Amino acid sequence: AIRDEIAKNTELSYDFLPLSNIKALLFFNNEKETEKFALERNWPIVNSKVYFNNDQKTNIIEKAMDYAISIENIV
Protein backbone atom coordinates (compact mmCIF):
# COMPACT_ATOMS: atom_id res chain seq x y z
CA ALA A 1 0.00 0.00 0.00
CA ILE A 2 2.83 2.41 0.83
CA ARG A 3 4.55 1.62 -2.48
CA ASP A 4 1.44 2.10 -4.61
CA GLU A 5 0.59 5.35 -2.80
CA ILE A 6 4.12 6.61 -3.50
CA ALA A 7 3.70 5.50 -7.12
CA LYS A 8 0.48 7.52 -7.39
CA ASN A 9 2.24 10.54 -5.88
CA THR A 10 5.20 10.21 -8.26
CA GLU A 11 3.06 9.68 -11.38
CA LEU A 12 2.07 13.37 -11.31
CA SER A 13 5.06 15.19 -9.76
CA TYR A 14 8.30 14.00 -11.36
CA ASP A 15 8.94 14.15 -15.10
CA PHE A 16 11.91 12.27 -16.60
CA LEU A 17 12.88 10.53 -13.37
CA PRO A 18 15.98 8.30 -13.57
CA LEU A 19 15.37 4.71 -12.50
CA SER A 20 18.40 4.68 -10.19
CA ASN A 21 16.74 7.29 -7.97
CA ILE A 22 13.41 5.47 -8.36
CA LYS A 23 14.99 2.35 -6.83
CA ALA A 24 15.51 4.21 -3.54
CA LEU A 25 12.47 6.51 -3.78
CA LEU A 26 10.03 3.57 -3.87
CA PHE A 27 11.84 1.93 -0.90
CA PHE A 28 12.76 -1.06 -3.08
CA ASN A 29 15.89 -3.16 -2.61
CA ASN A 30 17.04 -4.40 -6.04
CA GLU A 31 16.64 -2.87 -9.50
CA LYS A 32 14.83 -5.87 -11.00
CA GLU A 33 11.82 -5.48 -8.71
CA THR A 34 11.77 -1.74 -9.44
CA GLU A 35 11.61 -2.42 -13.18
CA LYS A 36 8.91 -5.05 -12.67
CA PHE A 37 6.83 -2.65 -10.57
CA ALA A 38 7.26 0.10 -13.17
CA LEU A 39 6.08 -2.31 -15.88
CA GLU A 40 3.06 -3.13 -13.71
CA ARG A 41 2.22 0.59 -13.64
CA ASN A 42 2.91 0.79 -17.41
CA TRP A 43 5.68 3.38 -17.21
CA PRO A 44 8.17 3.32 -20.11
CA ILE A 45 11.72 2.38 -19.14
CA VAL A 46 13.54 4.12 -22.00
CA ASN A 47 17.23 4.17 -20.97
CA SER A 48 16.14 3.81 -17.32
CA LYS A 49 14.49 7.25 -17.71
CA VAL A 50 10.85 6.77 -16.73
CA TYR A 51 8.51 9.16 -18.54
CA PHE A 52 5.16 9.09 -16.74
CA ASN A 53 3.64 11.22 -19.53
CA ASN A 54 -0.07 10.40 -19.15
CA ASP A 55 -22.68 13.93 -15.60
CA GLN A 56 -23.66 16.74 -13.24
CA LYS A 57 -25.73 18.73 -15.78
CA THR A 58 -25.61 20.13 -19.31
CA ASN A 59 -23.88 23.50 -19.17
CA ILE A 60 -25.58 26.70 -20.38
CA ILE A 61 -28.69 24.91 -21.67
CA GLU A 62 -29.87 23.11 -18.54
CA LYS A 63 -29.12 26.01 -16.20
CA ALA A 64 -30.83 28.63 -18.37
CA MET A 65 -33.89 26.45 -18.96
CA ASP A 66 -34.15 25.70 -15.25
CA TYR A 67 -33.91 29.41 -14.40
CA ALA A 68 -36.70 30.11 -16.89
CA ILE A 69 -38.83 27.31 -15.42
CA SER A 70 -38.28 28.56 -11.87
CA ILE A 71 -39.18 32.11 -12.91
CA GLU A 72 -42.37 31.21 -14.78
CA ASN A 73 -43.77 28.32 -12.72
CA ILE A 74 -44.33 30.39 -9.57
CA VAL A 75 -45.29 33.43 -11.74
Partner: protein, 153 residues
Protein backbone atom coordinates in the same frame (compact mmCIF):
# COMPACT_ATOMS: atom_id res chain seq x y z
CA UNK B 1 -75.09 45.73 -34.38
CA UNK B 2 -77.70 45.22 -37.10
CA UNK B 3 -80.95 47.17 -37.27
CA UNK B 4 -84.34 46.72 -38.90
CA UNK B 5 -87.11 49.30 -39.07
CA UNK B 6 -90.22 49.17 -36.93
CA UNK B 7 -93.32 48.20 -38.89
CA UNK B 8 -95.53 51.35 -38.96
CA UNK B 9 -98.81 51.61 -37.05
CA UNK B 10 -98.01 48.61 -34.87
CA UNK B 11 -97.36 51.28 -32.23
CA UNK B 12 -101.16 51.47 -32.03
CA UNK B 13 -100.90 47.88 -30.83
CA UNK B 14 -97.62 48.99 -29.16
CA UNK B 15 -96.34 45.52 -30.09
CA UNK B 16 -93.25 46.37 -32.07
CA UNK B 17 -92.30 43.05 -33.64
CA UNK B 18 -90.67 41.41 -30.63
CA UNK B 19 -91.97 38.14 -29.20
CA UNK B 20 -89.68 37.35 -26.26
CA UNK B 21 -89.95 33.59 -26.74
CA UNK B 22 -86.28 33.42 -25.71
CA UNK B 23 -83.89 35.21 -23.38
CA UNK B 24 -81.24 35.21 -26.13
CA UNK B 25 -82.47 38.56 -27.45
CA UNK B 26 -83.12 40.37 -24.18
CA UNK B 27 -79.57 39.85 -22.90
CA UNK B 28 -78.15 42.61 -25.12
CA UNK B 29 -78.65 46.10 -23.67
CA UNK B 30 -79.51 49.10 -25.82
CA UNK B 31 -76.90 51.85 -25.91
CA UNK B 32 -77.51 55.20 -24.23
CA UNK B 33 -76.72 57.59 -27.08
CA UNK B 34 -78.39 55.20 -29.54
CA UNK B 35 -81.70 55.75 -27.75
CA UNK B 36 -81.20 59.50 -28.21
CA UNK B 37 -81.52 59.08 -31.98
CA UNK B 38 -84.30 56.60 -31.18
CA UNK B 39 -83.68 52.85 -30.96
CA UNK B 40 -86.97 51.25 -29.90
CA UNK B 41 -88.89 54.05 -31.64
CA UNK B 42 -88.10 53.36 -35.31
CA UNK B 43 -85.79 50.32 -35.63
CA UNK B 44 -85.72 47.40 -33.21
CA UNK B 45 -82.15 46.24 -32.67
CA UNK B 46 -80.86 42.77 -33.54
CA UNK B 47 -78.18 40.44 -32.20
CA UNK B 48 -74.78 39.81 -33.78
CA UNK B 49 -73.02 36.43 -33.63
CA UNK B 50 -69.78 35.99 -35.55
CA UNK B 51 -69.59 32.33 -36.55
CA UNK B 52 -66.10 31.02 -37.27
CA UNK B 53 -64.68 27.95 -39.00
CA UNK B 54 -61.92 25.60 -37.87
CA UNK B 55 -59.93 26.20 -41.06
CA UNK B 56 -60.04 29.98 -40.65
CA UNK B 57 -59.23 30.15 -36.93
CA UNK B 58 -56.47 27.53 -37.21
CA UNK B 59 -54.57 29.52 -39.79
CA UNK B 60 -55.21 33.15 -38.92
CA UNK B 61 -52.80 32.17 -36.13
CA UNK B 62 -50.09 32.65 -38.79
CA UNK B 63 -50.19 36.42 -38.23
CA UNK B 64 -48.18 35.86 -35.05
CA UNK B 65 -45.84 33.11 -36.27
CA UNK B 66 -42.30 34.40 -36.65
CA UNK B 67 -39.93 33.39 -39.42
CA UNK B 68 -38.19 30.11 -38.64
CA UNK B 69 -34.71 31.56 -39.29
CA UNK B 70 -35.06 34.25 -36.59
CA UNK B 71 -35.15 32.21 -33.38
CA UNK B 72 -31.53 31.04 -33.58
CA UNK B 73 -30.34 34.47 -34.75
CA UNK B 74 -28.32 36.05 -31.98
CA UNK B 75 -28.04 39.79 -32.42
CA UNK B 76 -24.75 41.69 -32.50
CA UNK B 77 -22.76 40.94 -29.35
CA UNK B 78 -21.88 44.59 -28.67
CA UNK B 79 -25.40 45.88 -27.99
CA UNK B 80 -25.95 42.98 -25.59
CA UNK B 81 -23.12 44.36 -23.42
CA UNK B 82 -23.94 48.07 -23.71
CA UNK B 83 -27.52 47.27 -22.73
CA UNK B 84 -26.32 45.25 -19.73
CA UNK B 85 -24.00 48.05 -18.59
CA UNK B 86 -26.73 50.68 -18.97
CA UNK B 87 -29.21 48.48 -17.10
CA UNK B 88 -26.70 48.00 -14.28
CA UNK B 89 -26.09 51.75 -13.98
CA UNK B 90 -29.83 52.41 -13.98
CA UNK B 91 -30.18 49.72 -11.30
CA UNK B 92 -27.55 51.45 -9.16
CA UNK B 93 -29.31 54.80 -9.45
CA UNK B 94 -32.73 53.26 -8.78
CA UNK B 95 -31.35 51.46 -5.71
CA UNK B 96 -30.03 54.78 -4.40
CA UNK B 97 -33.47 56.30 -4.99
CA UNK B 98 -34.98 53.30 -3.18
CA UNK B 99 -32.74 53.99 -0.19
CA UNK B 100 -33.85 57.62 -0.06
CA UNK B 101 -37.47 56.48 -0.53
CA UNK B 102 -37.26 54.16 2.48
CA UNK B 103 -35.63 56.97 4.45
CA UNK B 104 -38.41 59.42 3.55
CA UNK B 105 -41.24 56.92 4.11
CA UNK B 106 -40.62 56.83 7.88
CA UNK B 107 -42.33 60.20 8.45
CA UNK B 108 -45.24 60.24 5.99
CA UNK B 109 -48.95 59.76 6.64
CA UNK B 110 -51.14 57.39 4.63
CA UNK B 111 -53.25 60.18 3.12
CA UNK B 112 -50.11 61.24 1.25
CA UNK B 113 -48.75 57.79 0.33
CA UNK B 114 -52.12 57.09 -1.31
CA UNK B 115 -51.22 59.93 -3.71
CA UNK B 116 -47.47 60.40 -3.16
CA UNK B 117 -46.24 58.60 -6.29
CA UNK B 118 -48.56 60.36 -8.73
CA UNK B 119 -46.28 62.61 -10.78
CA UNK B 120 -42.87 61.22 -9.80
CA UNK B 121 -41.05 58.00 -10.62
CA UNK B 122 -41.87 55.41 -7.96
CA UNK B 123 -38.37 53.95 -7.50
CA UNK B 124 -39.70 50.45 -6.79
CA UNK B 125 -41.72 49.44 -9.84
CA UNK B 126 -38.86 50.79 -11.96
CA UNK B 127 -36.45 48.50 -10.10
CA UNK B 128 -38.68 45.45 -10.52
CA UNK B 129 -39.37 46.24 -14.18
CA UNK B 130 -35.68 46.71 -14.95
CA UNK B 131 -34.77 43.50 -13.13
CA UNK B 132 -37.42 41.44 -14.90
CA UNK B 133 -36.71 42.90 -18.35
CA UNK B 134 -32.94 42.49 -18.12
CA UNK B 135 -33.29 38.98 -16.69
CA UNK B 136 -35.64 37.91 -19.49
CA UNK B 137 -33.39 39.40 -22.17
CA UNK B 138 -30.36 37.80 -20.54
CA UNK B 139 -31.94 34.34 -20.22
CA UNK B 140 -33.00 34.45 -23.87
CA UNK B 141 -29.47 35.48 -24.87
CA UNK B 142 -27.89 32.65 -22.85
CA UNK B 143 -30.26 30.05 -24.24
CA UNK B 144 -29.77 31.21 -27.83
CA UNK B 145 -25.98 31.26 -27.47
CA UNK B 146 -25.81 27.80 -25.93
CA UNK B 147 -28.36 26.25 -28.28
CA UNK B 148 -26.56 27.50 -31.37
CA UNK B 149 -23.13 26.60 -29.97
CA UNK B 150 -24.30 23.02 -29.42
CA UNK B 151 -26.71 22.30 -32.29
CA UNK B 152 -25.15 24.41 -35.05
CA UNK B 153 -21.75 22.73 -34.64
Amino acid sequence: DAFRLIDTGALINNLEPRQTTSNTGLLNKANIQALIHGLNRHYYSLNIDYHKTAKETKMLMNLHKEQWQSGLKMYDYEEKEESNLAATKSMVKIAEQYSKRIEEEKELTEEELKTRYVGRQDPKKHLSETADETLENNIVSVLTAGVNSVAIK
